């Protein structure tokens, strides 16, 4: 338990960037804890972010670097953050023919209709960014999508 010196230096780094953008004053608007946390490598669900301090609209609450540190490590206590393993069993729930292909109409339906719904815009972005193409009707390889998404925007 308790973060390390380097871990702290890291949070601080992301942290400084964030308070810089909403006005360098040592505070980061609570409506940015999730984004902040994502920049530290984590992948929090909205339920997690709200149970840990996030708010919806700006101007409500603010956090110092020292307050965010404990939020970061509590957050990182959860282990079902999700594995390739898990994402795979889930896509197959939808894999009608068991080849590993899924209509991009459907995945996008899943992503915008189920769970913590995603925006039309966000779906296009992640598909463009991971460079995942659909064929005539030799659709989307859902594992291709999973790996690139899990690999991040900056591969190498």
């Amino acid at each position: 338990s308790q973060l390390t010196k380097d871990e702290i230096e890291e949070v601080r780094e992301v942290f400084d960037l964030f308070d810089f953008w909403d006005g360098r004053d040592g505070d980061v608007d609570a409506a940015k804890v999730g984004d902040l946390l994502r920049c530290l490598g984590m992948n929090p669900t909205e339920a997690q972010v709200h149970q840990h301090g996030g708010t919806k609209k700006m101007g409500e609450k603010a956090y110092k670097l020292e307050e965010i540190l404990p939020i970061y490590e509590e957050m990182s206590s959860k282990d079902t953050g999700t594995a390739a393993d898990e994402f795979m069993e889930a896509f197959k729930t939808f894999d009608r023919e068991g080849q590993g292909l899924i209509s991009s109409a459907e995945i996008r339906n899943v992503l915008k209709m189920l769970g913590e719904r995603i925006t039309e815009d966000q779906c296009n972005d992640i598909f463009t960014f991971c460079d995942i193409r659909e064929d005539i009707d030799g659709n989307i390889k859902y594992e291709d999508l999973m790996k690139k998404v899990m690999a991040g925007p900056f591969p190498d």
Partner: protein, 145 residues
Amino acid sequence: RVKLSQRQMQELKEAFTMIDQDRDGFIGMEDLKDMFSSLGRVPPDDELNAMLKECPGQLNFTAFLTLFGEKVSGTDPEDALRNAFSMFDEDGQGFIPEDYLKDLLENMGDNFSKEEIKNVWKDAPLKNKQFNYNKMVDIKGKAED
């Protein structure tokens, strides 16, 4: 700090020299008022001297660089500044959308004062309620309008 790069110092070498001719390199009283002759503008006594106050006394070229120890402090090089403005200009040249730039300086980064904001608006190259950065970068060093 030493950021007073050779490009800047040598540039300051030709500057201090045109004036000079003063007993072996010293921008003295006369060297100055004389200058304001081929300068096309008015020269005031007291002030001409108040400008001396700034350095201990007697201005060779060394002290002339030390005097410019407030000029270097921030001066990020030539281009660097243009690129910096670039980043906030999607629509290539014609430049930055006023609103943005205001919100950009007034309440982001190292916030600008509502007072520093105006000092900036008074001159600011503008049209279509939009900003002109390459013209602003020019003003910084300045080769005139």
